């Protein structure tokens, strides 16, 4: 090793570089959210696969397993307040059933769309990047902000940002 500070990757390119079925199925999602490139498709995919691993690994063990009680509940607990999983779904099996549209729907470009500020999802990029949007008490210029459940009634416009 060289450096004491840690680093990590967020997106991995697909194994097959060319598929006619994997471009429309991406533009149908890229055009739905008005993203910039194809990284966020993989970045959301990488995040979903990350949490899918723990649930799949934990599901193999019995209910009385101590790690299932501790790590399994802590996985749902984080998944609950993040807004990915509705509160009424409280089983480890529902984590695998989650798709990539759930995490994409919690992006700030999608939350401000449903609040009534940007008519088009492409127009919301300027508002978030221009610092017109404040989440409670802090200005935000990162469109990929995944809000929590408590902050859903808390996104609103700022007050004459510089």
């Amino acid at each position: 090793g060289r450096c004491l500070r840690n680093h990590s990757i967020t997106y991995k390119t697909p194994k097959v570089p060319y598929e006619r079925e994997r471009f429309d199925a991406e533009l149908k999602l890229v055009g739905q959210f008005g993203l910039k490139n194809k990284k966020e498709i993989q970045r959301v995919h990488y995040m979903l696969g990350h949490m899918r691993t723990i649930a799949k690994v934990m599901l193999m063990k019995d209910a009385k397993d101590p790690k299932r009680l501790l790590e399994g509940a802590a996985l749902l607990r984080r998944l609950h307040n993040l807004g990915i999983l509705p509160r009424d779904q409280n089983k480890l099996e529902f984590v695998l059933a989650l798709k990539e549209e759930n995490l994409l729907e919690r992006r700030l470009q999608t939350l401000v769309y449903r609040k009534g500020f940007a008519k088009s999802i492409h127009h919301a990029r300027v508002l978030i990047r221009g610092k017109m949007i404040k989440v409670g008490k802090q200005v935000v210029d990162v469109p990929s902000f995944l809000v929590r459940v408590e902050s859903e009634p808390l996104i609103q416009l700022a007050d004459n940002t510089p």
Partner: protein, 215 residues
């Protein structure tokens, strides 16, 4: 229209409502119009176009061989092959064979019965020629981990999660789909633990309704 077989008349006259009832008693579908009645809106796909040749005294008698796989995503799929001079006819000729060769696709669970079927019930292997395809159940999240050739067939059968291992000359596309179809074809032939009980007794559709077709 105008069936010429005993089972065909029952389908036309609205006596058999479900295709699975035919699979129960081993009745062989001999008219492709039967499937077009009980299974409307069947998804369509052409696997490949392969040209074969025969050397003659004057030249080569080239013919086009078409593999098409059809089925509904609810647990039915088929596969048929036809060779003909015309490209359009080869697809049409394989259309009938695909309908003629329907088979149930048994699906099951992996972890628990929390809703709907997603994977195969148990491990299966397709006994094609050199190509052998093995089907392994997978958890809910995992998609169809397979080559582009059998994955497109597994989509039409309704299976959404599966693990596949392959062995042989998989670059032969004709044997690849044949192996995939063969593995699924014997899904209902493996006596698992949940099929021990005999169950109820049901009369055959061709015996309850035998008198209506006797006149």
């Amino acid at each position: 229209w105008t069936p010429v077989t005993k089972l065909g008349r029952l389908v036309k006259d609205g006596k058999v409502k479900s295709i699975d009832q035919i699979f129960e008693f081993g009745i062989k579908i001999k008219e492709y119009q039967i499937v077009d009645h009980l299974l409307p809106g069947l998804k369509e796909e052409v696997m490949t176009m392969q040209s074969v040749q025969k050397q003659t005294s004057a030249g080569q008698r080239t013919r086009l061989k078409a593999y098409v796989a059809i089925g509904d995503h609810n647990g039915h799929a088929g596969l048929g092959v036809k060779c003909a001079k015309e490209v359009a006819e080869a697809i049409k000729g394989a259309m009938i064979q695909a309908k003629l060769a329907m088979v149930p696709v048994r699906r099951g669970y992996w972890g628990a019965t929390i809703g709907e079927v997603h994977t195969v019930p148990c491990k299966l292997t397709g006994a094609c020629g050199s190509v052998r395809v093995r089907l392994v159940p997978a958890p809910r999240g995992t998609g169809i981990v397979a080559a582009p050739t059998p994955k497109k067939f597994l989509i039409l059968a309704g299976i959404e999660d599966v693990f596949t291992q392959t062995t042989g000359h998989t670059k032969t596309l004709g044997n690849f789909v044949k192996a995939t179809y063969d593995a699924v074809r014997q899904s209902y032939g493996f006596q698992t633990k949940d099929l021990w009980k005999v169950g109820g007794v049901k009369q055959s559709p061709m015996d309850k309704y035998a008198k209506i077709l006797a006149e």
